[PDB]
Amino acid sequence: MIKEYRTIKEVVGPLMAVEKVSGVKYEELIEVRMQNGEIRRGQVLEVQEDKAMVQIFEGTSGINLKNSSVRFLGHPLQLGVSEDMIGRVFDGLGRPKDNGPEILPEKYLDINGEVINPIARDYPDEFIQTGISAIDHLNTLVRGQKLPVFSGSGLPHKELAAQIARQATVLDSSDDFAVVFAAIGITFEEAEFFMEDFRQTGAIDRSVMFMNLANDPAIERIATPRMALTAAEYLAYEKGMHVLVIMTDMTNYAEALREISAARREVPGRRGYPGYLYTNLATLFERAGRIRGLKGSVTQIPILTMPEDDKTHPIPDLTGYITEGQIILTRELYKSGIQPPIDVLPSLSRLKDKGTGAGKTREDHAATMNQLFAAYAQGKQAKELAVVLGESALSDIDKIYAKFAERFENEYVNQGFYTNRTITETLDLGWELLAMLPRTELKRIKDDLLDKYLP
Amino acid sequence: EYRTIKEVVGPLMAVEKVSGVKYEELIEVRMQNGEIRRGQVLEVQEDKAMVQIFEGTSGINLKNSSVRFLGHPLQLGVSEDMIGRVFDGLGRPKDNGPEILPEKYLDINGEVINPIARDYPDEFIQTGISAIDHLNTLVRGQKLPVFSGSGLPHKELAAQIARQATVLDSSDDFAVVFAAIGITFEEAEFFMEDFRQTGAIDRSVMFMNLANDPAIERIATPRMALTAAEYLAYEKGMHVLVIMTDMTNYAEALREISAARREVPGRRGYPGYLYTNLATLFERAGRIRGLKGSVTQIPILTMPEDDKTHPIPDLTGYITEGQIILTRELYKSGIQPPIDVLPSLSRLKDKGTGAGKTREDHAATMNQLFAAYAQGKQAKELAVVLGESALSDIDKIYAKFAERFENEYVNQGFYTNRTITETLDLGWELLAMLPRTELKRIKDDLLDKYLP
Amino acid sequence: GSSGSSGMQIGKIIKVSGPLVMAENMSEASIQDMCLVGDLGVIGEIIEMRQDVASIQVYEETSGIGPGEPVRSTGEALSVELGPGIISQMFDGIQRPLDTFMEVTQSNFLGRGVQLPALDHEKQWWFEATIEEGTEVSAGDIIGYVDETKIIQHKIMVPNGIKGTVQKIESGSFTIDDPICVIETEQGLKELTMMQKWPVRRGRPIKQKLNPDVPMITGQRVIDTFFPVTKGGAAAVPGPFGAGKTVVQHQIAKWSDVDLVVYVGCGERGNEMTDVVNEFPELIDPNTGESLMERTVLIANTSNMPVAAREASIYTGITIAEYFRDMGYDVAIMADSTSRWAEALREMSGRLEEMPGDEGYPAYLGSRLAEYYERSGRVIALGSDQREGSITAISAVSPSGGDISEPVTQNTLRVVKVFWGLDSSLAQKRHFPSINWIQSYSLYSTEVGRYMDQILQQDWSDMVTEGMRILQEEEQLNEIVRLVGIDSLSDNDRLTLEVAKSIREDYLQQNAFDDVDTFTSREKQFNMLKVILTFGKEARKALSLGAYFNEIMEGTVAVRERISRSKYIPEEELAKISSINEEIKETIQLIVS
Ligand SMILES: [Cl-]
Numbered sequence A: 001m002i003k004e005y006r007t008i009k010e011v012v013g014p015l016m017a018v019e020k021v022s023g024v025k026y027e028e029l030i031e032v033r034m035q036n037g038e039i040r041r042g043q044v045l046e047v048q049e050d051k052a053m054v055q056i057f058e059g060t061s062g063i064n065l066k067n068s069s070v071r072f073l074g075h076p077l078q079l080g081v082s083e084d085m086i087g088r089v090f091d092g093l094g095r096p097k098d099n100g101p102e103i104l105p106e107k108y109l110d111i112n113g114e115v116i117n118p119i120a121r122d123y124p125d126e127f128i129q130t131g132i133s134a135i136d137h138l139n140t141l142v143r144g145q146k147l148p149v150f151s152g153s154g155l156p157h158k159e160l161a162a163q164i165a166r167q168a169t170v171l172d173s174s175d176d177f178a179v180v181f182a183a184i185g186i187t188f189e190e191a192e193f194f195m196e197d198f199r200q201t202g203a204i205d206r207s208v209m210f211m212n213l214a215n216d217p218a219i220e221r222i223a224t225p226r227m228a229l230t231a232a233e234y235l236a237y238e239k240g241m242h243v244l245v246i247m248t249d250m251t252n253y254a255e256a257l258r259e260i261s262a263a264r265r266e267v268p269g270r271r272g273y274p275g276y277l278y279t280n281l282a283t284l285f286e287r288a289g290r291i292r293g294l295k296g297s298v299t300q301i302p303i304l305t306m307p308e309d310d311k312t313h314p315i316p317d318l319t320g321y322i323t324e325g326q327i328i329l330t331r332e333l334y335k336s337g338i339q340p341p342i343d344v345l346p347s348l349s350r351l352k353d354k355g356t357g358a359g360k361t362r363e364d365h366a367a368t369m370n371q372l373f374a375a376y377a378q379g380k381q382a383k384e385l386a387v388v389l390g391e392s393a394l395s396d397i398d399k400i401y402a403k404f405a406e407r408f409e410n411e412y413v414n415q416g417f418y419t420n421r422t423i424t425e426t427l428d429l430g431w432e433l434l435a436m437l438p439r440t441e442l443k444r445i446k447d448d449l450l451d452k453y454l455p
Numbered sequence B: 001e002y003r004t005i006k007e008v009v010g011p012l013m014a015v016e017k018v019s020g021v022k023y024e025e026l027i028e029v030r031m032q033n034g035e036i037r038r039g040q041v042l043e044v045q046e047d048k049a050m051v052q053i054f055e056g057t058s059g060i061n062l063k064n065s066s067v068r069f070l071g072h073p074l075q076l077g078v079s080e081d082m083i084g085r086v087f088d089g090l091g092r093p094k095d096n097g098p099e100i101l102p103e104k105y106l107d108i109n110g111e112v113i114n115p116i117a118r119d120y121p122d123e124f125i126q127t128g129i130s131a132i133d134h135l136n137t138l139v140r141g142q143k144l145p146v147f148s149g150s151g152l153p154h155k156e157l158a159a160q161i162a163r164q165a166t167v168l169d170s171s172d173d174f175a176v177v178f179a180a181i182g183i184t185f186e187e188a189e190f191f192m193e194d195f196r197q198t199g200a201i202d203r204s205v206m207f208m209n210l211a212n213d214p215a216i217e218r219i220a221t222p223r224m225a226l227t228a229a230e231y232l233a234y235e236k237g238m239h240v241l242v243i244m245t246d247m248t249n250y251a252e253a254l255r256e257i258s259a260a261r262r263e264v265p266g267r268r269g270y271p272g273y274l275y276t277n278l279a280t281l282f283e284r285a286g287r288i289r290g291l292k293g294s295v296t297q298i299p300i301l302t303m304p305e306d307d308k309t310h311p312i313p314d315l316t317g318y319i320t321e322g323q324i325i326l327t328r329e330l331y332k333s334g335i336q337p338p339i340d341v342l343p344s345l346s347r348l349k350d351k352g353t354g355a356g357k358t359r360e361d362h363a364a365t366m367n368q369l370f371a372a373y374a375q376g377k378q379a380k381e382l383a384v385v386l387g388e389s390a391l392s393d394i395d396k397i398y399a400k401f402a403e404r405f406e407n408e409y410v411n412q413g414f415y416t417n418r419t420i421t422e423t424l425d426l427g428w429e430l431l432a433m434l435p436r437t438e439l440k441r442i443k444d445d446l447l448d449k450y451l452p
Numbered sequence C: 001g002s003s004g005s006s007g008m009q010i011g012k013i014i015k016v017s018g019p020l021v022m023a024e025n026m027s028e029a030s031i032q033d034m035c036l037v038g039d040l041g042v043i044g045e046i047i048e049m050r051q052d053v054a055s056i057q058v059y060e061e062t063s064g065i066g067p068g069e070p071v072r073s074t075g076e077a078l079s080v081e082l083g084p085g086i087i088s089q090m091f092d093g094i095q096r097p098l099d100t101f102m103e104v105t106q107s108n109f110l111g112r113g114v115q116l117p118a119l120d121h122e123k124q125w126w127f128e129a130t131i132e133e134g135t136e137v138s139a140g141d142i143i144g145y146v147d148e149t150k151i152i153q154h155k156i157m158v159p160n161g162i163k164g165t166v167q168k169i170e171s172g173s174f175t176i177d178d179p180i181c182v183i184e185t186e187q188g189l190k191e192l193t194m195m196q197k198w199p200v201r202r203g204r205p206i207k208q209k210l211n212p213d214v215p216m217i218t219g220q221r222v223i224d225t226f227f228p229v230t231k232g233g234a235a236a237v238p239g240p241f242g243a244g245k246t247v248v249q250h251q252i253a254k255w256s257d258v259d260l261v262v263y264v265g266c267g268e269r270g271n272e273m274t275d276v277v278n279e280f281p282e283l284i285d286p287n288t289g290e291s292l293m294e295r296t297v298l299i300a301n302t303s304n305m306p307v308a309a310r311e312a313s314i315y316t317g318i319t320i321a322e323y324f325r326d327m328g329y330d331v332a333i334m335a336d337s338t339s340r341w342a343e344a345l346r347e348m349s350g351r352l353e354e355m356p357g358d359e360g361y362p363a364y365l366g367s368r369l370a371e372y373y374e375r376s377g378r379v380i381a382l383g384s385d386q387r388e389g390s391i392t393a394i395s396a397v398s399p400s401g402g403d404i405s406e407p408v409t410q411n412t413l414r415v416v417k418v419f420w421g422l423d424s425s426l427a428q429k430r431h432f433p434s435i436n437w438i439q440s441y442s443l444y445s446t447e448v449g450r451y452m453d454q455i456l457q458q459d460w461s462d463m464v465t466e467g468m469r470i471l472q473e474e475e476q477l478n479e480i481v482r483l484v485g486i487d488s489l490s491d492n493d494r495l496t497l498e499v500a501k502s503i504r505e506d507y508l509q510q511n512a513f514d515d516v517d518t519f520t521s522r523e524k525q526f527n528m529l530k531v532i533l534t535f536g537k538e539a540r541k542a543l544s545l546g547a548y549f550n551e552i553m554e555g556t557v558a559v560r561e562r563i564s565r566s567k568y569i570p571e572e573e574l575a576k577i578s579s580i581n582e583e584i585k586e587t588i589q590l591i592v593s
Helices: A157-167 A188-201 A224-237 A250-263 A277-285 A314-322 A331-335 A365-389 A396-413 A423-434 A447-453 B154-164 B185-198 B215-235 B247-260 B274-282 B311-317 B362-386 B393-410 B420-431 B444-450 C098-105 C221-226 C245-255 C270-282 C308-326 C338-351 C365-373 C407-413 C424-428 C445-456 C460-484 C491-508 C522-544 C549-554 C557-563 C580-592
Strands: A003-005 A008-012 A015-018 A028-033 A039-048 A051-056 A069-076 A078-081 A088-091 A107-110 A149-151 A178-186 A207-213 A242-248 A297-305 A325-328 B005-009 B012-015 B026-030 B036-045 B048-053 B066-069 B075-078 B086-088 B104-107 B146-148 B174-183 B204-210 B239-245 B286-288 B294-302 B322-325 C011-017 C020-024 C033-037 C042-050 C053-058 C070-077 C079-082 C125-129 C142-147 C153-157 C164-169 C172-174 C181-185 C188-192 C196-199 C208-210 C234-238 C260-266 C296-301 C330-336 C377-380 C388-397
Touching (some): A078 A224, A149 A157, A157 A242, A178 A188, A178 A250, A224 A250, A250 C365, A277 A314, A297 A314, A365 A423, A396 A423, B026 B048, B075 B215, B146 B154, B154 B185, B154 B239, B174 B247, B215 B274, B247 B311, B274 B311, B294 B311, B311 B322, B362 B420, C020 C033, C142 C164, C221 C522, C260 C338, C270 C296, C338 C365, C338 C388, C365 C407, C491 C522
Parallel strands (some): B086 B204, B146 B294
Antiparallel strands (some): A028 A069, B005 B012, B012 B048, B026 B036, B036 C011, B286 B294, C011 C020, C020 C053, C142 C153, C164 C181, C208 C377
C-alpha cells in the first residue's frame, strides 16, 4: 500500500507543508506528484502532530497546491548500488544521465550511511605518491586520508585535482584507484574538463560520476555528496576497492545548506550559515579511511573555493578543523607562473608522520621536510623585505635565503601539471636546494643525515 | 473619519475597521485636543492600516483621536505664481506672501518618463564659472552634482550658480528651483538674504527645509521641488535648473526613517534601497521629445570623512552624469571656487559646446588645458619629492602653467560672472605660455586663428 | 456560482506592502503564474502560496492599491511572445512595446495597468514554407522562414512539446495569429502560427552544450589580445562609477561578430537607453548596408522604473537570446547592470521577511546568478538539423566603492571565465578602455591562443605572453621608481618601462569615438603588437652590444612616433604598419655603429 496525501497546505520556495498525515517519519523520502504528472522528490525535515515539513530537491516551480499530491515512501533517501555503477554517469540524485541501461541494484543503502566504530578503524599510513613534490614531501597524502584543496575562483584547482587522480599510486604494488566524482553546482565547462580528462586517460572505465551542475536545482546539492560517498563506501567496504573520491565545489554544498536554513527561518550562525555547519560537513568528510580486516579504502580530496580568498570564512575554517590537513592554492603563486600554485606554508598534512620514512619513502624524508619549511619561511620573509627596502637591507645570510625561496618556488614547487616525480627524485631535489645554505644553518637535520646526503 | 486607532508604537500607528484605504495614501489625525497631524499609510492589510505620523505620536490619546483618510498621496498645488515665492519642505508658504491659487494638484512622486519618449540632454547652460562652463560643461537636462565636504564653500558656490545661471539667446524662459534640505536656520538665512539681495529671487522658487523639521518632511522636500520644476518645464515650456543641498542630510533622514521602521540596514547602515531612492529623484532630470522645456539638476552633497566611496557620493556617482569636486587643498590656497578639474567630469558636455552653442574652439582648448594642467601638477609633485633640479626646462614651464591655471583661471571669486567668451579667451592666454609645438591636442587651423 | 451565474475565480487583495501583494481565493492558480492585480490590473507574479492565499510580486507601482480589490490569474507563467516583429523593438522589463505604449496611452510618461501584446499581431508577414508535407517533425525543426530584416531570416520552428507529421503547409502572407501549418500529432491535429510563447524563468531546451572555443572579435585591442571572450563564453565587467562601462559595452554591441545583440538596460540611466535608440540606427554596416538597430532587441527598465521589473528584464532578455540561438545564430546578451537585479531581489526578500544572507541579499542570490549564466553558452540546438548556436553573456557589475569583494561580483566570478575589471584611476588618467590589465583575466586565453596561432599561422600566443610579462614587470619596476626614483634603474630596466609604456598607450589605449581607432581588425592587431615587440627586441640586443639606453631613445624618436600612430592607419593600408619593423632594425643598428 502506497501512502499518499492530497493535502498540501503551503508552498514556500524550497519548502512545503503537508497536513492531515499519519505515520510519517523524520527524514523520510517523499515524492510530489504535480498536477501535470511531473514527479519531484523531497525529504521530511520535521514532523509534528498531523503535519510534515518537507524540502523539495527540484524546487516547487509551477506547482498547484490543490491538484498535487505528496507520496511518503516509507524509507529515507537511498542509493541502489551495484558494481555495475562503474563507468556510469548519474545526475545529482543518482539517476542515469548517460543514456545507458538502468542499473539492477544489488541492494539499497541509506545515503546517510553509518559511523565507522573508531575501534574498527585502521589507521591510514600507506604512502600515496602523487608525483607532486609539494604534496609528496611536505604535505604527504596517505591512503584513507581526507586531504582537501582550498582554492578560489579563477584558480587551477581542477588542474591539480585531475593531476593527482592521474598520477596517484602506492609503491611496491599494482593497486589502482576506482574514482568517485561528485560535481556540486559547477559549470558545464568545469565538469567537461574532468569528463575529458577521464575519457582521455581511460580512467572513466574505473569511475562512477554524480553530476549536479550550475543549471541543476540547488537543493539537490545537499544529497549529491552523500550519494557519492555511499557509492564510495560501498565499493570500498563491500567490493574491496581502493576508492579515490573527488568532490567539487564544496562551497556550493554549504550555500545550499544556508538556503534551506534561511528558508526555515532557523537561528543563524556566522555569515547566515546554520549552527550545524561543522557537524554537517563532518558527516561527509569523516566518511573516509580504512577498516580493520577489510582490503578496501576511501581517500577523499574535497575541493572548495574560499569566498573572498578568506581562509577564516566559515567554509574553509570549519573544513580545516575536520579534514586531515589542506592544500592551499594562492593567486600570488598562480600569477607568478607556479604550477601547481601551492603555498606550502599554510598547507598541511596531519597523517604524514606514519606514512613516511625508512621502508616507506626514505629515511631523510621528515628531516628535509622540516628544514625546507624553515628555510622557505625565512627566505620568503627576506624576499618580501628586499623588494621594499632593497637587496642591500638584508644580512649576508638572509640574502642566501632570499635566493633559496626563489629557486624553491620556481624549481621545486613549480613542476608542471603533467610532471610526475618519484619520491626519490623529490627528496634528491630537496637536497640540492638545501645545499645552497651553509651547513651550520641546517639545524633541523642531524649530522648523520647531512654527512650521507648533503652534497 | 475613523475613531478606531488600535495601537501606537513609537511613530507608528495601527488603524482598524477601515475600508477603501490604499498604499501610500495620506492620512489626517485629529487629536483629542483639536491638534491636527498628517501621516502616510505604509502598509494596508484587510481591515488594518499601518501609518506613520510626520510629527510623531507624542501626546496622542488613542480612543479620543480620529483618523481621516484623504484619498490621495502627498501632493503639491502648482501654479506659475510660485516664482518669487518661498515654501517649506511640504510646499507651505514661508514668506508671508499672498494666497496661492493652484492650477492643479500633483502627486509629488511624479511619473516616469517613457525611455522612448525621453530626449537626450542638449544645449548650453552658462553658469558663469569657468571650471564648469569650459572643462565640465552643464547641459540642459543633465544631472551634474557637486561633491564637497564639511567646511568647504559649497553654499557660496550654490548661490553663485543660482544667480548667474542663464541660457544664451533665449529670454524670459529660465527659472531656478532651489531646495534646501535639513539645513540650519542660519544657513537658510544666508541663502534667503543672498537671493533677495541679488534679485535672483525674482526668477526662483524656493523650498526651505530645516535641520529641526520632521525627517519625513526633509525627504519630501526634493520631491516637492522637482514636482514644481517639471510643471514649470513641461507645462510652461521653461528651462529649469534645480539646485538641492545638502543631499547628505537627505540620506541621513532616509536612514532615520528606515531605522524607525526597523528595516534591514544596508552598507554603512543606510537603507538597501538608497540607490533606487536617489534615482527616483535624479532621473526626473532630462528633456522630452516634442516638448519645449527641460529639467536640469545640481545635487550638492558633503562627502563624509571626504570619502568618495561612502554610499552617499558613491551611489550618486552611479546615477549622475559626472561630478564637480571641491577640495581642501585648493580651498586652503584661496581658490574660489576650489574646484579640482582632475577628478571632475561632465559626461554630456559634448551636447552643449562648439559652434552655435559656445564657440568652435571649445573642445580643443578643453582637451589641451586639461592635459597641460595634469602634466603641470605631475611636475609639481615631482619637484616636491625629488627637488627642483629633478625637472626639465619643459617640466618647469608646465609647473608654472598649473599655478596660473589655479590662480587666474579656476580662481575667479564667488561674485564674479564670466561669459563663455571670456572663459575661452582666458584659456588661450594660459595656453600661450606653452610652446606651440606642445599643443598637440589642437589642430593647426585653430592654433593659427586663436592663439595670441 | 453566485446570484444565479458563474465565471472564473476572482482573487481578493488582503494586503499591500510595496511591490508585495497578498490575495485570497487563489486556489486555482499555480506558483509562477502571472496575474492582474487590483482595479488597475497591474502585472504580477505568484511566488508563494499558503492555503488559498497567494503572495504576489508586482512588476508595476502599487501606490494607490488596497485590500478588497480583485485579482485575476492568467493561468500562465511569466512569458515572452516569440515571433516576427521582435527585432529592432524596445521593450520594457515584461516585454511591453514602449513606442506602442506611448501611442496608445498618448502620453510621454509611464502609466499603469496597460495591457499590450509584445508583438504586432496585425502586421502582414510573408511566410516562406521550406518544409514538405508528410515530413515527420519535432521541437526545433524549421518549417519555414520570414525575412524580418534584409539580413536576418526569422526561422519558424516547431514549438517544444509538438511532435508529428506535417499535414498541410504553404507559403503566403499571414499575421502571427494565422495558422500556417497543420501538424498531425498522436494527440490529434494541432495548428501552428509564426509565434510561440515561452516562460522566461525556464531555459529553452537544447541537445547539448559545447565548449566555447572560438574567440569573439570585438575589435577592442585590450580584450581580443589579453582578455578574450569566446562565442558562448561569459564576461563580467565590474567597475566603480565613471569608469566608462557604458562605452565599453556599446563598443562590443556594435563591433562584435554576432548575428544579434540583446541589450538589457537593467536598473540604470534613462539617457543611456536614449543614446542607444538614437545611435544604433545610425551605425551602418558597409558590407550589407544594415544598421546595428536592425539586429538588436532592446529591453529597458531604468533605475526609477518598477524595481521588480529589473529581474523581469533579465529573464525576458536571456529567453529572447535563447530563441534566436535555437535558430542557429550567435547572440550577445548585454546586462547592465546585474547589480540592480540583485538589489531587486534584496528588496523583495525584505518584503517577504526572509533571513538575509551576505550583505542583506537573499540566500539564493548565488544560485540565481549561476543559473542565469549557465543559460549562456555554445550549444547544439534541438531539431534534426542538429544546428549550432551560441549566447555570449556580457554583464556589468556595479560594486559599491569599486570593491569587488561584495556578493554580486564574487558569486559572478564563481561561474564566469572572463573578468574585465574597470579602474577609476585609469579613467581619471584618460586611459580608455579603463581595463586594469594586472587584475583582469580570461580563462579562455590559452585556448584562444591555440586558435589564433592556427588561424594566423604566427606565434601569436607567445607575443601575447611576452606583452603581459612586460606589463607585469613594469608594475614591479614602478614600485621601485616610487621608492628610489627612475634614475636608479639600469638601462635594461629603463628599456622595459619604455616598451611597457608603448604597449599601454600605443596598444591598450583605444578611442571609441575615433573613426579608425574605434575598431581594430585581427590582422591589424597582430601587426601593431608585432611592431611594438620588435622595437623592444632590437633595443634589447643593442644594449647587450654596448649601446646605452639614452642613445637608443634619442636616435629612435621618429620611429617610435610612427609606432604610436599605427592605430590610426586605415585597414587597407596595413602594409604601412608592417614596414615599421624594417625601420626599427635599420635605425637601431645604425645607433650601434
Ligand atoms: Cl557609472
